[PDB]
Amino acid sequence: EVDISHLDPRMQQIVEKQITTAVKQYHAKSGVIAIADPQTGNIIAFAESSKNKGLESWKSRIFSPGSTIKPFIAAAAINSASLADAIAKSINVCLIRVSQEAGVPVIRKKLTEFGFDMNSWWQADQSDDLQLAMAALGENIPVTIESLIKSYAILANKGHSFDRGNSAIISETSTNSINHMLENAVTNGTGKLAVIPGVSVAGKTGTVIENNDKYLALFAGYVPADNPRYVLLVVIEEGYFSKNGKTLVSGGELAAPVFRNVAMDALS
Numbered sequence: 001e002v003d004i005s006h007l008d009p010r011m012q013q014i015v016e017k018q019i020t021t022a023v024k025q026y027h028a029k030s031g032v033i034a035i036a037d038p039q040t041g042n043i044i045a046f047a048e049s050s051k052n053k054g055l056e057s058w059k060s061r062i063f064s065p066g067s068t069i070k071p072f073i074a075a076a077a078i079n080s081a082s083l084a085d086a087i088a089k090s091i092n093v094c095l096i097r098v099s100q101e102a103g104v105p106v107i108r109k110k111l112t113e114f115g116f117d118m119n120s121w122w123q124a125d126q127s128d129d130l131q132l133a134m135a136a137l138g139e140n141i142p143v144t145i146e147s148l149i150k151s152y153a154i155l156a157n158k159g160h161s162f163d164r165g166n167s168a169i170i171s172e173t174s175t176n177s178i179n180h181m182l183e184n185a186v187t188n189g190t191g192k193l194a195v196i197p198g199v200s201v202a203g204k205t206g207t208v209i210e211n212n213d214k215y216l217a218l219f220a221g222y223v224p225a226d227n228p229r230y231v232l233l234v235v236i237e238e239g240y241f242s243k244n245g246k247t248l249v250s251g252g253e254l255a256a257p258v259f260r261n262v263a264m265d266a267l268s
Contacts, residue, residue, distance in 0.1 A: 002034075002059045002146040003043055011035050011045035011230075014265045019234075022258045023049040026239030032058035033235075033262060036149045038156035038228040041163060043146060058235070062142050066206035067251075068220045069116070069138035070095050071155065071178055076110035077102040079174040087181045088189030090205060092137060099136035104128045107135055113161070113169050115151045117142050138206070148220065149233040155179070155202075156222035156231045183225045190252040191219065194260045199267065200225035203259065205251035214238055219255035223263045230266050234258045 015033040023031040030050040037044050048058045067090050074087055077098045086094035099107055108118040121140040122131065134140040143151075153162070159175035160166045170178070182202035185191050190205040203221025210216065217236040222228040234255040241248045248254065 001057075002046055002144070004046065006037070006040075006042035006044050007046070008035075008044045011266065012047065014262055015045045015047040018258060018262050018265070019047050020049040022234075022236065022254075023051065023239070026236055026241055026254055027051075028236050028239035030055055030058070030237040031235065031239065031258075032145055032233075033258065034145050034149050034233045035262070035266070036153050036231040036233075038153055038222060038231055039162065041150045041153040041157070041231075043149070046145070058145050060144065062144060063210075063216060063235075064208050065138040065141060065143045065148055066208040066216070066218060067092075067095075067138060068148065068152075068204050068206040068218050069111075069141060070136065071182060071204050072111055072114050072116065072151065073099050073102075073107065073136050074181065075114075075155075075159075075170050075174055075178050076107055078177055079110065079170045080106045084181045084184055087204070088185040090185075090190050096133045096136040099132040100129050102132075104132060107132055110169075111135070111141075113164075114154055115147055115161075115163070117147075138208075145233060145235065149231055152220045152222060152233065153231045155182070156228035179225055182221065186221070190250070191221070191256050193252060193256040194219065194221065194263075196223075196260060196264060196267075199223060199263075201260075201263065202228075203256070205256060207250045207252075215240075215249050217249060217251040217254040219251050219259045221259060223267070230263070232259050232262060234262075
């Protein structure tokens, strides 16, 4: 379960109002928002709202990160129709190719260093390329809200990992590129609804299909991009919103605007 000691009452109240409103507005099964401090990775706010009973809390719930893994795949490849475009538009085939060309040792080691479990959901006699494909899709990787936001905290912390005595996980060059890609993913990609005029926002959308037709809509990011103050992760479960005929269900459509509202509140 998520650590609850470093909580900030001002941040907590913000996310409490926002997630509860979003879950109702999206007719969602559940939803969660977490905020973390870029310097330490500590959770400073965590709130969830669920419409019905029996749900496991997002404090402990295990899920797949989906395309929110993509920045780390790119980071690993860079550190060892452009890549920036593929991150911005979230192009699966391209990131998969990037992962497969980087190779199993590079991807498994570097993603492990980012705080990802590259061991649990991994088969010994399964094709390396198939599993690198799954990695790029964030399909064979168990995360929690806590572990995922801590991984993003590393990127917000200039590619340094607090938990490893502030060691550089990726180079400065790599960090600059990745941050640029995440800013571009927001201003000119699937994360467009997270745009805040005058404030650079870095973030990545995700949309995960669970069993049958169960959607997780995700958005992970940090703000301001140039000198992060907050790391945020928003996850909506089985939410949807109708704009005329369109039924919107994706991370960019659901989770990103929620990220935006919390971010604007946090920056006062």
